[PDB]
């Protein structure tokens, strides 16, 4: 029992994205909807390989968001690029404005940050009401909850290209240099290894931000 052909705008036979156990998302077809226990499960047949039974927060539409339909806190799937492109879940941290050059800032579930274009993200079909509650990494879950609830109050540090600061990474504070500023992100060069990371200018991983937040009266 509880078989359905539709759930609002979700219709058996539609194109869809589904989350695999690798945490990457893949295109397929919604082949069934069923009410099981407290809610619905969605059966996806992937284009490449496999079938999965998924919760509604683990499927996304196969279309890009119209201009102006996402908000800070929206649960999305976005393109992640290493050389290779993958689709990974995240949270919208900033919506398009000229100063971010009309891009979306995404905080991915593993803590990675990037700006993406409108054609690089897909809306998750049935997010949790508090959208961060399905983020597995408790430190990213907690950060996102604080960030979304405080928005638009976003203390940031003003950094300039060529400035030298310490940046935290994996428990060590490293000598680093500001290479580039891009909206709410800064490209930090770690001097020891000469590798770069884009970091949010409100992150306490940046020593001037850590210093400001730790001070008190």
């Amino acid at each position: 029992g509880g078989e359905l052909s539709k759930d609002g705008d979700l219709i058996v036979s539609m194109r869809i994205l589904g989350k695999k156990r690798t945490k990457t998302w893949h295109k397929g077809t919604l082949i069934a909807i069923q009410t099981v226990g407290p809610g619905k499960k969605y059966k996806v047949k992937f284009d490449n390989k496999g079938k999965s039974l998924l919760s509604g927060n683990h499927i996304a539409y196969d279309y890009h968001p119209p201009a102006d339909k996402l908000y800070v806190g929206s649960r999305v799937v976005a393109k992640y690029k290493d050389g290779q492109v993958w689709l990974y879940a995240g949270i919208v941290a900033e919506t398009p404005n000229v100063k971010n050059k009309l891009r979306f800032l995404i905080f991915f579930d593993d803590g990675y940050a990037s700006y993406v274009t409108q054609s690089e993200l897909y809306p998750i079909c049935r997010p949790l009401k508090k959208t961060w509650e399905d983020i597995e990494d408790i430190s990213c879950r907690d950060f996102i909850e604080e960030y979304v609830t405080a928005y638009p109050n976003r203390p940031m540090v003003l950094l300039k290209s060529g400035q030298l600061i310490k940046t935290e990474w994996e428990g060590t504070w490293w000598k680093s240099r500001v290479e580039e500023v891009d909206g709410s992100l800064v490209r930090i060069l770690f001097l020891d290894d000469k590798r770069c990371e884009w970091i949010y200018r409100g992150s306490t991983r940046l020593e001037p931000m850590f210093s400001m937040k730790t001070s008190s009266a």
């Binding site: 593993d110 950060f143 990474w169 770069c196 990371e197």
Partner: peptide, 12 residues
């Protein structure tokens, strides 16, 4: 020349 992510906050 990307470093693997350090996340949004310092490691606990």
């Amino acid at each position: 020349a990307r470093k693997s992510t350090g996340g949004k906050a310092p490691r606990k």
